[PDB]
Design a protein around this ligand. Structure first.
Ligand SMILES: *C(=O)/C=C/N[C@@H](C(=O)O)[C@](C)(C(=O)OCC(N)=O)[SH](O)O
Length: 264
């Protein structure tokens, strides 16, 4: 029997779907795991890893992050609030990366994907840091279909957490790039009702959300700095069997609370 898992099972049953959780205390090595190795759609949460891949490239290409990109209207797609705002201005690669992470800006994400060689290029980056689970197959907006049983554009909560740890706390990026990634995540604006709602108010959090919406599919991953202690890395993903099943932010927050409670 798995007593630790029981509250998660009750939560997903009330939600009407499946919840996947993995949390790591980087100080002690303690973990909390629930469906941690099952695949869930990434949805917009891929944009955090996208920004990390761009940062990695920026290490070998002088001034890449500072480079202005003068895109046109043809680059814009729905939910591109920052890209639309700066259309008449242009944006640097750093500004596009921050917009993709902090506002889930779609045009910015597609522009950066282009720079990396598309979804296959981002997947190759993830393989290069040892993530064999992550796959991105499509661009915005198509990658958000979240069809049950479709492995396209998916990862697992465990692989997401492991990769997030390597990029934000480990050595996958050079230190100034690691710090930029953390700072972008810390400035996210879309996650106030997810992992952030589960964390004591005095603890710093960097996160990236995803919300396919269809098939009850939404998620969040985060690095959490409890004031005195080593950081925690965690991922919470959901899905449900029917197209019109609603996602729930409250369920993601509740799962995150259980994960923090269950950690040593
Ligand atoms: C990331 O989680 C974004 C999810 N939904 C976005 C998107 O697809 O980028 C939209 C809000 C959306 O409508 O979902 C896609 C769709 N075809 O329905 S758009 O408006 O940016």
């Amino acid at each position: 029997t798995n007593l630790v898992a029981e509250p998660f099972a009750k939560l997903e049953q009330d939600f009407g779907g499946s919840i996947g959780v993995y949390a790591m205390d980087t100080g002690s090595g303690a973990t909390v795991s629930y469906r941690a190795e099952e695949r869930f759609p990434l949805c917009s949460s891929f944009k955090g890893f996208l920004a990390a891949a761009v940062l990695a490239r920026s290490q070998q290409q002088a001034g890449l992050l500072d480079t202005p990109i003068r895109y046109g209207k043809n680059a814009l797609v729905p939910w591109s609030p920052i890209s639309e705002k700066y259309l008449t201005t242009g944006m640097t690669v750093a500004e596009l990366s921050a917009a993709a992470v902090q506002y889930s800006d779609n045009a910015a994400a597609n522009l950066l994907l282009k720079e990396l060689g598309g979804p296959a290029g981002l997947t190759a980056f993830m393989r290069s840091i040892g993530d064999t689970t992550f796959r991105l197959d499509r661009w915005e907006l198509e990658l958000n279909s979240a069809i049950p049983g479709d492995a396209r554009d998916t990862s697992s909560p465990r692989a997401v957490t492991e990769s997030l740890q390597k990029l934000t706390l480990g050595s996958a990026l050079a230190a100034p790039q690691r710090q930029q990634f953390v700072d972008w995540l810390k400035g996210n604006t879309t996650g106030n009702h997810r992992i952030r709602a589960a964390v004591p108010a005095d603890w710093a959090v960097g996160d990236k959300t995803g919300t396919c919406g269809v098939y009850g599919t939404a998620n969040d991953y985060a690095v959490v700095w409890p004031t005195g202690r080593a950081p925690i890395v965690l991922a919470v993903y959901t899905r449900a069997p029917n197209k019109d099943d609603k996602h729930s932010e409250a369920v993601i927050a509740a799962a995150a609370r259980l994960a923090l409670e269950g950690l040593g």
